Amino acid sequence: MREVINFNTWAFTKEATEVPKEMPEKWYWVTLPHSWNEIDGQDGGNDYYRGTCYYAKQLKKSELPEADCYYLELRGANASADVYVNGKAVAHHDGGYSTWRVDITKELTEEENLIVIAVENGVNDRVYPQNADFTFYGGLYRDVNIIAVNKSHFDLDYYGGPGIKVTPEIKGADASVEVEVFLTNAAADQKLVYTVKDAEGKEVAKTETAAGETKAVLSIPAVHLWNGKKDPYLYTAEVALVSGEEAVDAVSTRFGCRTFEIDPERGFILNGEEYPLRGVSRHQDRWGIGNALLPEHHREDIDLICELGATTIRLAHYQHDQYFYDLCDERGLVIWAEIPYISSHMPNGRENTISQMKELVVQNYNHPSIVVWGLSNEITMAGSSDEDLLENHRILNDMVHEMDHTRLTTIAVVSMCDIHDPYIQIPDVISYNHYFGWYGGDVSMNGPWMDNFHKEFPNIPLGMSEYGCEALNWHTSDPKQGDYTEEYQAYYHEEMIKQLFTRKYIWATHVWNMFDFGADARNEGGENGQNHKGLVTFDRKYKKDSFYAYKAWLSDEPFVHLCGKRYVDRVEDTTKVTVYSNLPEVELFVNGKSAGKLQAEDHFFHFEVPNVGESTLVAVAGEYKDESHIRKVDTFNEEYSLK
Amino acid sequence: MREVINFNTKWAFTKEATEVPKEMPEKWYWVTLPHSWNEIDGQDGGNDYYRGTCYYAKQLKKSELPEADCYYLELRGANASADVYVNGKAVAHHDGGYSTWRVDITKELTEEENLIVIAVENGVNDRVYPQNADFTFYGGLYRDVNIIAVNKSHFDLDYYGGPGIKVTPEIKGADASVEVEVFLTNAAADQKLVYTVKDAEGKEVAKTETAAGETKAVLSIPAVHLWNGKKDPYLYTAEVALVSGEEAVDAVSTRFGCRTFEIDPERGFILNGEEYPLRGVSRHQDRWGIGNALLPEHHREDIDLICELGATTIRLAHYQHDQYFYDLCDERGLVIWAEIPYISSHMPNGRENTISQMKELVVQNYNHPSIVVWGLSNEITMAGSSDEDLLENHRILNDMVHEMDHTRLTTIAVVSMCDIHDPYIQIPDVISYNHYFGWYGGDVSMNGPWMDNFHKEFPNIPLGMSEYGCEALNWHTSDPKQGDYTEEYQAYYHEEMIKQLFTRKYIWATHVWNMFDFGADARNEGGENGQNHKGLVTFDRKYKKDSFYAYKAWLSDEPFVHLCGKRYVDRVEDTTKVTVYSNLPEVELFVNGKSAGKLQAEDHFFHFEVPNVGESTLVAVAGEYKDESHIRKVDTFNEEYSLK
Numbered sequence A: 001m002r003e004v005i006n007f008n009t010w011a012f013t014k015e016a017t018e019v020p021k022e023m024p025e026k027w028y029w030v031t032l033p034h035s036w037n038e039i040d041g042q043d044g045g046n047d048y049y050r051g052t053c054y055y056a057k058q059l060k061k062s063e064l065p066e067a068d069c070y071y072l073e074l075r076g077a078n079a080s081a082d083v084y085v086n087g088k089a090v091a092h093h094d095g096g097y098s099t100w101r102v103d104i105t106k107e108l109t110e111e112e113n114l115i116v117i118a119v120e121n122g123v124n125d126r127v128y129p130q131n132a133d134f135t136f137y138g139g140l141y142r143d144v145n146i147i148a149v150n151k152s153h154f155d156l157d158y159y160g161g162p163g164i165k166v167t168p169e170i171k172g173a174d175a176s177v178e179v180e181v182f183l184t185n186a187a188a189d190q191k192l193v194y195t196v197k198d199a200e201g202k203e204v205a206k207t208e209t210a211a212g213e214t215k216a217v218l219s220i221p222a223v224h225l226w227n228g229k230k231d232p233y234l235y236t237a238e239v240a241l242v243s244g245e246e247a248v249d250a251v252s253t254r255f256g257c258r259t260f261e262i263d264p265e266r267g268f269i270l271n272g273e274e275y276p277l278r279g280v281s282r283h284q285d286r287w288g289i290g291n292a293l294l295p296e297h298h299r300e301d302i303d304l305i306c307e308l309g310a311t312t313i314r315l316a317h318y319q320h321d322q323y324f325y326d327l328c329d330e331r332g333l334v335i336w337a338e339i340p341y342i343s344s345h346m347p348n349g350r351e352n353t354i355s356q357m358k359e360l361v362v363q364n365y366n367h368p369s370i371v372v373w374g375l376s377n378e379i380t381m382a383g384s385s386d387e388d389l390l391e392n393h394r395i396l397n398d399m400v401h402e403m404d405h406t407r408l409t410t411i412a413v414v415s416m417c418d419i420h421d422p423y424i425q426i427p428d429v430i431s432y433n434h435y436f437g438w439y440g441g442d443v444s445m446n447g448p449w450m451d452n453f454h455k456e457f458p459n460i461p462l463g464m465s466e467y468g469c470e471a472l473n474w475h476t477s478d479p480k481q482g483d484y485t486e487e488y489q490a491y492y493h494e495e496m497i498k499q500l501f502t503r504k505y506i507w508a509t510h511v512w513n514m515f516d517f518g519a520d521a522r523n524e525g526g527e528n529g530q531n532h533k534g535l536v537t538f539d540r541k542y543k544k545d546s547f548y549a550y551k552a553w554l555s556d557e558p559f560v561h562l563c564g565k566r567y568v569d570r571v572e573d574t575t576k577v578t579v580y581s582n583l584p585e586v587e588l589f590v591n592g593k594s595a596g597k598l599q600a601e602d603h604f605f606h607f608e609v610p611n612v613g614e615s616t617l618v619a620v621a622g623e624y625k626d627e628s629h630i631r632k633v634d635t636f637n638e639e640y641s642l643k
Numbered sequence B: 001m002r003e004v005i006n007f008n009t010k011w012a013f014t015k016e017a018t019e020v021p022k023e024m025p026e027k028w029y030w031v032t033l034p035h036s037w038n039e040i041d042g043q044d045g046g047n048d049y050y051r052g053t054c055y056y057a058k059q060l061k062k063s064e065l066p067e068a069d070c071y072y073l074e075l076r077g078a079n080a081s082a083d084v085y086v087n088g089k090a091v092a093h094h095d096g097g098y099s100t101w102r103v104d105i106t107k108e109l110t111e112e113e114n115l116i117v118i119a120v121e122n123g124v125n126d127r128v129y130p131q132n133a134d135f136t137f138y139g140g141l142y143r144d145v146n147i148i149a150v151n152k153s154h155f156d157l158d159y160y161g162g163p164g165i166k167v168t169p170e171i172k173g174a175d176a177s178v179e180v181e182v183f184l185t186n187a188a189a190d191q192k193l194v195y196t197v198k199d200a201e202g203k204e205v206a207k208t209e210t211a212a213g214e215t216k217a218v219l220s221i222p223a224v225h226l227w228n229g230k231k232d233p234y235l236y237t238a239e240v241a242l243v244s245g246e247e248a249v250d251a252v253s254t255r256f257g258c259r260t261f262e263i264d265p266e267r268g269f270i271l272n273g274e275e276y277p278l279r280g281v282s283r284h285q286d287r288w289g290i291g292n293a294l295l296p297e298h299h300r301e302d303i304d305l306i307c308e309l310g311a312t313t314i315r316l317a318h319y320q321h322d323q324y325f326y327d328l329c330d331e332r333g334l335v336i337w338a339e340i341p342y343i344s345s346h347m348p349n350g351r352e353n354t355i356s357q358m359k360e361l362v363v364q365n366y367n368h369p370s371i372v373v374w375g376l377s378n379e380i381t382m383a384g385s386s387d388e389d390l391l392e393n394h395r396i397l398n399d400m401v402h403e404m405d406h407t408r409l410t411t412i413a414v415v416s417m418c419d420i421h422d423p424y425i426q427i428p429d430v431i432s433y434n435h436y437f438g439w440y441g442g443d444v445s446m447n448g449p450w451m452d453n454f455h456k457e458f459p460n461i462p463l464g465m466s467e468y469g470c471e472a473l474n475w476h477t478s479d480p481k482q483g484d485y486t487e488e489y490q491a492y493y494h495e496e497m498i499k500q501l502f503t504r505k506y507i508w509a510t511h512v513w514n515m516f517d518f519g520a521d522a523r524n525e526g527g528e529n530g531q532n533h534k535g536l537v538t539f540d541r542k543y544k545k546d547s548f549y550a551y552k553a554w555l556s557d558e559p560f561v562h563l564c565g566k567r568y569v570d571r572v573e574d575t576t577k578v579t580v581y582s583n584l585p586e587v588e589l590f591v592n593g594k595s596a597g598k599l600q601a602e603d604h605f606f607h608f609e610v611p612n613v614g615e616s617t618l619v620a621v622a623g624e625y626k627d628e629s630h631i632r633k634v635d636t637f638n639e640e641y642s643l644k
């Protein structure tokens, strides 16, 4: 009989200094998801308002189903929030990326109850993040829910977890699945019925023990393994708590059956066979709405990612929305989840690392798509590691290892960090953030660097958690690092793909970033407030040419893509032309006359064609075609150049 | 039947915890409050004193508690931000480590052994003042933690840590109309309220009854003995009791004094109609060795030394002080300037804290007759000229103070270099400047002309000197220079500062910075790091510097004679000057028994010259009072005397 009520439709202000004692009448109206940094946090100057803001909404006991207790669930309040019911402080949280709850049954004394939520995203030495290349969008950017449950219920107060913990064990062709639940105010005489359901919902296992036994082991014969995108099979665990034979409360969670390994020489292994993890990272924001994404935004992001053919996503730099982790479960993406422990170690932030890390594991333990827990990102950027940095990490490593025996810990290291720094040796695996070819150096340096690490530390699995290069709507025929041209970014990824994708020992690579994202302190490239290293634009409206370089290597979608479509006016008499395709042969036609048929090891078909007058280019690979136009001109169209 | 229970003994303390402990710690460090974990690392320098989160833990045995309907936890001082847990449950948070706060915890006393965990924190953030000040932010429970047992119906304990009673006297001629306001909680409409106002000897002088529904009464006292400063710090006591039947289920009380005052822009401070020059000192709430974990005797000793000095006012900077110390000022007739730690840099996001601390200051100290001005900020424009956020912040405080307290004025402590035409100076009722001409560059003589120039330009704003001072360690010279840190130059500086300030009646109040040396862990100057050495007495209160006696000469009617330079013995010159302070008219000086001359000092600064030959014994005499010292001729300056 557990019921969930949406509570998203709220008075807001940034000027209050105190909890209002009655419903405000002159405050601005918002419906959640909401953030007050939607505009000021994506235009630059690092001027997005950071402070304390108040939300106000009235909760009428009448317009409510009746249960023994009413909880207020908050899926995301960035960064720190305080909750008042009728003026009385009832709950506080620090961490803008996790779910927390609060039982408010006793505070609903009135017919109409005033719920005020203050949210804060300022500076302080306690709550992460504080130093990162991404806007700390303030507010209630995820749902706010009201949960009505029986007096006896599965746990809602333990670190915002689901109250159920499923752990499959694979014995041969069968699965033995531990389904542990956690109860609150349970009577010794109640029973718990455990059911494991089919992908089509057909009951495959069921058992029944008393409330006293919150753990059970159900067998699944001939279990269909969660084999990622090949076959991302999902079972459904479902526990009901019964009084008499009435079921007063029940919880559930989809789950997946899989084993995996991270061999330091063979790379990632899934269910016994090698499964190369090649993919991208994604931030949880979009142009114009800050980070108040709706479900369709998640759906659209994953669709664009799966269209690219990525088999892994690095979900930096923080815990993402549950719905997006679900999508990754259904689609078969291997995910790297982490906490906002980044850039500089604040000693007084140790508690917050432990707090967020626990919510990360507790709330997401049941996502088959997740295989590693990231402890920190570029944490030694400030300098070499301290004893306090090392202790803070060991504490987290041990805590994760004890809570979850089925996954591995990882680290994302700043490029410059000495490979002999003690902190690299703490977690199971590690990945480096390298920007050779954008932040100086040459893109040819990446391959060698990785190799030379692997020679030094051949038994620590090494990944590339970050690589990328900026790209706006600038174009040139001589791509060069620093021009922000779509072409150079395309050349950069061509070389990166050829270097990384051919090295099996790199257990995972992650393009930074899949999309452009909000970083209000950025002021470069002709458009401020954004990091432009994505393969797709901040509004998900334009796939850059580099997006198709990756489709050529990783997608089973037959396609043909002409690069350069936005670079029309060119001065040279002969011009270079590049086609990306996952098909063997590609023929290019300039104004109807074929310029040749080509194949390519690396799926990058490089043509050279005469540039005379106005020409129309057409790429054909079997039954697939694409269209580009160009035009000779006497001088370079400066509208293409950043200057 | 309200009962207060001390709760300071045996607390488990740690700086290494990461979470609230589930059971009573067995290996933590035992402490008894008042306590601060910065008692050493916060007074030695390096700015390294530990700032973060540390945990206190102690058991509450229900049996040992008296029988009452409700049990409140009270905290007089938790620097800077704290959280309260009762059996792992959170039940209260607070921001501001100088105010009193309480929390009703009856319903979480579910066991016979209840685990109370208070987490205290003094870190870095943009919300809670202070964050940039020249004094240590001592962490921990440095003031009393009490438990209050009261009846279900009781006087308010949840309104910003107030007393639940607000006494406001009005002086109509030779009589006083005393307004008595009390505040209740869960009061039955059929209970009564008995207001009684008693004597300085406790003899009932007025009394009225009313039902719980009338929480405001005006009682008369004719021929009222006014609180007239040091001349007569007369104190009545108000006393309201809540009765159910003729049981008295709860009762509150407060001392108060009835006085009027004015801050005239030309006549200075006026008290009860008569001019009453406010010339005094500032005082910090710390002390060498124990950080800010002060016991009553330390408050007593602190004001005793001030009373010996004869100061008529104290600037209790930079924050709300302890309740005991405000009381003492009430008893001794000192006129007090109180303020909040809104200091140095304006943080936009700290606005809510300025309002909470300022609301707490006024509610928790409205009743102290010694207080006349509420300070809004100290050197708030240091890190720049006044902008709109700073100015809205100040107007908001100014109006709130004026709305809650009609009988007092608001002031500010302006940093020295702040343009006198800053819109910031125009917000409060009065203002004072913090000037260090003669220490932070400049010359001591500049103080007079500067104050004259402001007074010319702004004749209608009462101007005071909220801070002046000069460092002084145990260094000595016969050639005082700004920057040698010598006891001599600091005495010369304060002589000149006295002749300039004490003769200008329009300055409504002067505050020597500071009465005592104090803890400022970021300082590293003078030969002893971790302290500000601008006091007239040293951090441990064991040595009154010469400058101390220069003021006693001007403010004490305790007749005395002081030889300065007692610690400067070996001197090189053949003739040496000898400074004597005395509030008597004539001083004769004797060198080895032979008299070197009588002297009458109008300014009480008796400057003699004497020969320096061999071992000389100096004796100063003013009637029946004498003082002694010793000097010695030497060939070369004693290097032990110079900072070098």
Ligand SMILES: O=C(O)[C@H]1O[C@@H](N2CCN(c3nnnc4c3sc3nc(N5CCOCC5)c5c(c34)CCCC5)CC2)[C@H](O)[C@@H](O)[C@@H]1O
Pocket: A132, A133, A134, A377, A378, A433, A439, A440, A441, A466, A468, A512, A531, A533
């Ligand atoms: O940056 C991204 O795109 C993403 O990567 C991660 N981080 C990567 C490293 N990091 C940097 N951020 N900004 N600038 C530089 C670095 S390192 C570096 N090295 C540089 N060179 C110095 C000369 O010699 C060779 C190296 C130069 C610059 C930078 C910029 C100025 C010119 C030279 C912080 C962000 C963040 O997790 C992510 O949130 C962010 O979005």
Ligand SMILES: O=C(O)[C@H]1O[C@@H](N2CCN(c3nnnc4c3sc3nc(N5CCOCC5)c5c(c34)CCCC5)CC2)[C@H](O)[C@@H](O)[C@@H]1O
Pocket: B133, B134, B135, B318, B378, B379, B434, B440, B441, B442, B467, B513, B532, B534
């Ligand atoms: O300082 C005290 O003891 C007390 O005074 C008040 N505040 C006064 C000003 N302020 C300063 N603190 N420390 N140093 C300086 C200032 S201003 C200044 N100006 C200076 N030069 C400017 C250019 O020309 C010559 C003079 C110099 C110095 C300082 C120090 C080094 C030498 C030159 C903060 C404290 C505080 O309200 C009080 O909380 C504090 O305890």
Ligand SMILES: Cc1cc2nc3c(=O)[nH]c(=O)nc-3n(C[C@H](O)[C@H](O)[C@H](O)COP(=O)(O)O)c2cc1C
Pocket: A155, A158, A161, A162, A163, A164, A165, A182, A361, A362, A363, A365, A403, A404
């Ligand atoms: C993924 C996961 C979910 C968990 N969920 C709960 C829970 O909902 N309720 C609960 O009491 N314990 C839960 N636990 C475990 C215990 O809370 C925990 O191991 C132990 O009781 C320590 O509790 P503490 O963190 O409060 O010290 C969970 C553990 C894991 C690994």
Ligand SMILES: Cc1cc2nc3c(=O)[nH]c(=O)nc-3n(C[C@H](O)[C@H](O)[C@H](O)COP(=O)(O)O)c2cc1C
Pocket: B156, B159, B162, B163, B164, B165, B166, B183, B362, B363, B364, B366, B404, B405
């Ligand atoms: C010095 C002083 C002490 C006060 N103490 C209390 C008090 O203890 N309880 C109370 O209800 N009101 C007290 N008041 C007044 C009211 O709190 C105030 O007029 C009004 O209730 C403001 O409430 P708010 O601060 O919650 O907005 C006090 C006022 C002053 C000036």
